[PDB]
Write a protein that binds this ligand. Structure first.
Ligand SMILES: *Cc1c(COP(=O)(O)O)cnc(C)c1O
Ligand SMILES: *Cc1c(COP(=O)(O)O)cnc(C)c1O
Lengths: 405, 405
């Protein structure tokens, strides 16, 4: 079983005070706090083992290379990829989507084709496709939303045709907490010869993810939302696709030979997609984050978080004039607005109580426009949050309502 | 004055042992060791202040935003840029060059134009220009080398013409230690209306750098060579150029508005070029590295390193059959080969003595081809290295020569 008190003991930020008051950090969906096991793994690498990792002959450099490739293997087992060589280290979900959009998109999407996204996508999984569509003359089609925050799946027959080259779809909404029916949508997309990129940035910390079972063609997530350091993420690509993809960034370590008279040739995937000095510190930290999460157990995490979410939704019924957005079975986040008060003001009062929530458009302006609001508040309920933190949120919303009503 | 013993006390890796023997780390040009002040600045941020930095309303997020923008200001003062808004955070020199090559190169270099590089460039400052030239149909011209490792500057009249759009040139060679006459070359390039990108990855840790005095249009360097963390670097761009450049990566934080029916508009530079969650941990660490280097004083560093280099060159005269590459006035690095022995074998013996040097092509294959060797050894003499470490290198080379001769 899961013990939230033991977990919290690993996270030094959680004893912080804000505005003279104890912090209630309800913004893990924007970025997660990190356990000391992750912080110290990176620090200890810098203190005792640091070197460049170009398979350098000298000992420290050879050992750093091995650490980095071990993390690639660990990450591939974490998402059940068939091969470690199907994983590319990127800065994060955003860079991974841009890499696919340029390397795969530029040589596979042509004038007159179409790409399908959803109306709930994060900007990271919108803008690169708008740029691609503008570069090659393709059309960006959109799966619309239902009022309860689920996809209008009945529209799929009008959107998929012979010219559909790619579905790019979120696994879990960063605003609504909706989990999309990926396995079934990927079956439909593949029936038309379309590939599927999955934005998994809000899925990988809440329950096991298995890319062979999903059969997705691309999968991306960020380390800093998975209790890990900033500056590092993972792009998974099916081996047969990745081996045909041309490089994106050029430079050292992704070449086989460089000549100023005969041109340059590329190395093999995945190293062809990793130019320049890798983020070795971030990679070490990410490896430690995966080990920490696996030691807790993602099914234990999912069970505790689901219980916390059920409790929060039950308690929030006692907040007058609270509007919630999204389905009852949400994962991770609670998007809401309080009466007619602007999210920014609600979030400012909550911050004044020491409660950190996010307000604004959450990098999902098309989703805000669907609900005809300029902004929302969002509380994240992660594995280190508590019933008492939920109680503080509910009470704070009640007091804000009383005061501003 | 400079005290190398006090400096070394800040670097925990330097007490490491390798192969049972005390480490002599002579590979800082590949990546530098980090002082505990840098390691702990990042660790303490993760432990006490961590949050997402989207100018988030809540306190931790607002304070993280301020820390990040303070580092941008500190970096701009470090290189004497006129404005903090002329600096873009990138993963490193390599990504910064790719960003310029795509954003600026794609809309300013046309079929029939030419770009000028040098034969001593690192692959980071070659491959992106080869890719650009292939995309738009331009020609990549090359300033050749002299035998002493300096540029053949007399060839410049044959290379610069009305169609020359860009000179991309290294400040300091990562192999030879040659420092190029940037100010004069930039004057010549500007006379023709060409812009100049400077690869400063091997300059910024050896002496003050002043981009207003240089008048370069772009300048790039990496944090991990400047005693800082991996995963972070700086791209400087003149304000008037940067404000006209289109975005490269798309996603959150670089947009002003996102619409699925009316399209998307971009925010202002530099934030237009920073998509997704920044590498906040790396940014904090980089700020601490700049403060550490400034506290030591770069003129103090330069004086000590120049004295160390003069001593090493004097002592290496007693190594039989040693071939050195590059000019007598080199900065930072000593490139060499020992008789007819392959660099890989020499480097393996040195590693076996606990001495870390780099061997191979050093991401400069055109430079190796110029000297008609497949590989070289390279020793870096940084601010924390000692006369006694130089003595170990000289003795090791003498023993290798005796043993293998
Ligand atoms: C280090 C090096 C590079 C590459 O820097 P990265 O941090 O790997 O991106 C580019 N140019 C020179 C001169 C270098 O020494
Ligand atoms: C976090 C988020 C992103 C962006 O991730 P970055 O780390 O900022 O690149 C993309 N998609 C979703 C669903 C997210 O929650």
């Amino acid at each position: 079983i899961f013990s939230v008190d033991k977990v919290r003991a690993d996270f030094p930020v959680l004893s912080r005070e804000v505005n003279g008051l104890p912090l209630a950090y309800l913004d893990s969906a924007a970025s997660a706090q990190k356990p000391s096991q992750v912080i110290d793994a990176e620090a200890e690498f810098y203190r005792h083992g640091y070197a460049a990792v170009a398979r350098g002959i000298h000992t420290l450099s050879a050992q750093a290379t091995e650490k980095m490739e071990n993390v690639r293997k660990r990450a591939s087992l974490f998402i059940n990829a068939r091969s470690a060589e199907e994983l590319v280290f990127v800065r994060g979900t955003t860079e991974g989507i841009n890499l696919v959009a340029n390397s795969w998109g530029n040589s596979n999407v042509r004038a007159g084709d179409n790409i399908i996204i959803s109306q709930m996508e994060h900007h990271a999984n919108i803008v690169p496709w708008q740029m691609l569509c503008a570069r090659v003359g393709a059309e960006l089609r959109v799966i619309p939303l239902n009022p309860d925050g689920t996809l209008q799946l009945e529209t799929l027959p009008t959107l998929f045709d012979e010219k559909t080259r790619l579905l790019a779809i979120t696994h879990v909404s960063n605003v609504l907490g909706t989990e999309n029916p990926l396995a079934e949508m990927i079956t439909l997309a593949h029936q038309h010869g379309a590939k599927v990129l999955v934005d998994g940035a809000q899925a990988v910390m809440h329950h096991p993810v298995d890319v062979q079972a999903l059969d997705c063609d691309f999968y991306v997530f960020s380390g800093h939302k998975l209790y890990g350091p900033t500056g590092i993420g993972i792009l998974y690509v099916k081996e047969a696709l990745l081996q045909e993809m041309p490089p994106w960034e050029g430079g050292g370590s992704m070449i086989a030979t460089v000549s100023l008279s005969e041109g340059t040739t590329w190395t093999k995937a995945p190293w062809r997609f990793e130019a320049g000095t890798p983020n070795t510190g971030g990679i070490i930290g990410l490896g430690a984050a995966l080990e920490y999460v696996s030691a807790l157990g993602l099914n234990n995490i999912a069970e505790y978080e689901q219980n916390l979410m059920h409790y929060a939704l039950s308690q929030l019924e006692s907040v007058p004039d609270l509007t919630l957005y999204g389905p009852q079975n949400r994962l991770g986040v609670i998007a809401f607005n309080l009466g007619k008060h602007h999210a920014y003001d609600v979030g400012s009062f909550l911050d004044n109580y020491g409660i950190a929530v996010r307000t604004g458009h959450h990098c999902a302006m098309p989703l805000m426009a669907y609900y005809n609001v300029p902004a929302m508040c969002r509380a994240s309920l992660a594995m280190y949050n508590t019933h008492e933190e939920v109680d503080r949120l509910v009470t704070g919303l009640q007091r804000i309502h009383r005061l501003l009503g």
